[PDB]
Structure formats: C-alpha cells, structure tokens
Design a protein around this ligand. Sequence first.
Ligand code: HEM
Ligand SMILES: Cc1cc(O)ccc1C[C@@H]1NC(=O)[C@H](Cc2ccc(O)cc2)NC1=O
Length: 394
Amino acid sequence: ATVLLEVPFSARGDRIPDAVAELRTREPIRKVRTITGAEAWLVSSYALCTQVLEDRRFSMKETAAAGAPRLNALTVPPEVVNNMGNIADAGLRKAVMKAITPKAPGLEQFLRDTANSLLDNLITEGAPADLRNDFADPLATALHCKVLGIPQEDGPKLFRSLSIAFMSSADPIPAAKINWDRDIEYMAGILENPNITTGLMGELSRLRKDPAYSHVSDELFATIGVTFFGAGVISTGSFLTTALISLIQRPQLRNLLHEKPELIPAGVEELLRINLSFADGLPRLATADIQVGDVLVRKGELVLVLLEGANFDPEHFPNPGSIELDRPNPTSHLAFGRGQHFCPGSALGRRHAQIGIEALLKKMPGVDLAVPIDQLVWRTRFQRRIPERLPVLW
Ligand code: HEM
Ligand SMILES: Cc1cc(O)ccc1C[C@@H]1NC(=O)[C@H](Cc2ccc(O)cc2)NC1=O
C-alpha cells in the first residue's frame, strides 16, 4: 500500500529529478500531498502551467483564505499575500515599478563596483571562498539597500530575517512574526527619516506626504519596503547562487562567456530557464470549477504550478537540459512567472545576475568547485533551493 505522492520532490537545486519528466509525460496534472497534509493539483507541463498562470480564476490572494488547503503556513500577514494588488489599489504601481528598474543612474556601476570589491576580498583571503555567503548574497543585499535608498549598513540585519521569513513550513513560525514586526518598525522609521530621499523608500516617503496619497495607510508603505527587500534579496541571491553552480558545472560555457562577454545576457536567460531556485510550485486557489487537461479542478482546490515542469518541457524547449544560447524562444520560460503576478523585479534580477557573472568570470576565470558537488548541503523546508555554502577555488 502506497501513500499519495508528496511534494516537494527534492531540495537539491543542482539537478532536476528524473521523476519530473515521467510525471509530465504520464500525468501533467495530478494529485499530490503537501507538507501540511493538504491535497493539491501539481501541474508540470508548459501548456498547463501557462494556462493556470494566465487564468485569474486561479487566485493568489485566495490562497490566504482561512480554511483553504495550504502548501505551507503563512509567514506574513494574510493581507500581504495580496501585496501587489494592494500596491495597485493605492495608485503606487507605476512608482514602485519605476524605482526597481536597473536603469536608475549609477545603479549598474554600483553593482559592478560592489561585485568587484567582494571578489577582491575573496582573492585576498585565498581559496576556498564561499560564493553564496561571501558573494551572491552580499551582492543581492547591497543591491537592494541601494534600490530601496536605505543605508548599506542596515542590510545584514534585514537579511538575517530571510532564513526564517522564506521558510516553507507545515506550521506557523513564531520567529517569523518577531522579525516581521521588527522589520516593519524599521521601514516605518525609514519613512519618517529625512535623510532617506533616494530609491524606493525615498519615493514612497515623498508620495506619503502628497495629497493624492493621504489616505494610503502607513502600514502599506512600510510593507512595500519589507516585502520588496525580502522577495528581491532572496530571489536574486538564490538565483545567482544556483546559476553559478550551473556555470561551474559547464567549463566550456564558462570559457565561452569569459571569452565573449556579450553573450552573457543570452547565457543568463538560459540559466534562468533551467534554474531550480523555486523549491515549491507556485500556489493558486481555484475560485471556480475549471478544466485543466484531463482534470476538472473544483472551486476551493489548491493548484501548484511547477516552474521546472514548464521550463524543462521538451515540447517547448527541445533538449531542455542543455544551455543553448540560440533558442528561438529564449525569454518564453516561466522563471519570473506569467500573467497577473509576473515578477516586477525581472529586469533587476537579470542585471544582478549578468553583472555578478561578468565580474566573477573576469576576476576568477578558473573558478571551480572546491568540493565534490554531492557535498553541497541543500536547505530544506524553504521556499528556495540553495546550498548552505558554495565552496570554490580558482
Ligand atoms: C532572478 C530573480 C528573481 C526571480 C527568479 C523571481 C521570481 C519570481 C516569480 C516566479 C514570481 C511569481 C510568483 C507567483 O506568481 O506566485 C515573482 C513575483 C514577485 N517578485 Fe520576483 N523574482 C526575482 C527577483 C525579484 C526582485 C529583484 C524583486 C523586487 C525587488 C522581486 C519581487 C517580486 C514580487 C513583489 C513579486 C510578486 C508580484 C505580484 O504578485 O504580482 N523579485 N518573482
Ligand atoms: C514570505 C514573504 C516574505 C517577504 O518579505 C516578501 C514576500 C513573501 C512572499 C513570498 N515571496 C515570493 O517570492 C513569492 C512571490 C511573492 C508574492 C507576494 C509578494 O509580496 C512578493 C513575492 N511568493 C511568496 O509567497
């Protein structure tokens, strides 16, 4: 006698389980059990993943409803699941999206300077170096302090909330509320701090005192800062970390991008496509009865959109495990989602990874793992897949 298939399948972020391909072929939508004990529909083909993400009747905000089947416990207030919707309703979407583009004057130069300084420090200390804790994550943190307009020295403390904030837990997490409340208090103080005049928080601080926004809540302004810092830092840091592994595992790609750095954007796009940083499918709750493939999903049921299901689907990306810089459909992957909730930080995430990789390949052309790849320790019960340390030599 066998139990219902459990998700997630593996916390390892360096390879996709052979099981995903068998599942996509045989049952591209099928029932699974989540860590909470709830049942859910796991969707694993490109066609069905796109269908779900483009149909707003599969709702993100409704996943936070009391009594719904859950992928994991909330680590944020329930109203925060609707964060982008609240931003839009407050009239703040254009201003927020403008503040988080990589086009702001000096931002890209700051990123390059920061990456080079981090790498110089590692070279001075000598191999082995930890490219997650001493490169990718500090680069992500520095970037988001700059984007938010907050002091660089405040980055590390905000960062240390994230190993709990992005847990994927069966049960509520007491530490998540402690850190959330503290970080909200911090951002509320930032909005009242007259020295904060640049970046996203500088812009929100101005709009907060503009008569057109006088009824927008101080809670929402603070929440934007906390959530954009957290989502951005965890997403860019984790993506860059696992992209570096994928590059290290491919010496000839590493050498091609070192020799022809103009190919780095196309390389980053393929690294995004094959990336396994999202540890769970994207959750949606059905608000109606909806046919998805051979399954009639019923109102109130949980659907999980498996990004690597779509992104390794050979019907859409032939030879899907191979990084090919000349695909005809290179940005059509789902690494940033699709539809209503498409990632607002997609351009910034691309530039973070492009600049980080360019800098690493220039400073450490001989970069290689300093331990056998099986020795990487993969974080469990987390919303991202990441190795606890990434030891390299060069
Ligand atoms: C490579 C880096 C990144 C990746 C791979 C990534 C991935 C994603 C994905 C897949 C979603 C869709 C989630 C869903 O539909 O359920 C998403 C949404 C989001 N991302 Fe990103 N992201 C990245 C960088 C960033 C950055 C830099 C920020 C902000 C600074 C950010 C903020 C957000 C926010 C706020 C949402 C929710 C948007 C909404 O609900 O409409 N992300 N991200
Ligand atoms: C737990 C948390 C702590 C934070 O500090 C910020 C945001 C999350 C939520 C978590 N993060 C994500 O990257 C995606 C996409 C997403 C949804 C809503 C959102 O506001 C931002 C992003 N979904 C999530 O459920």
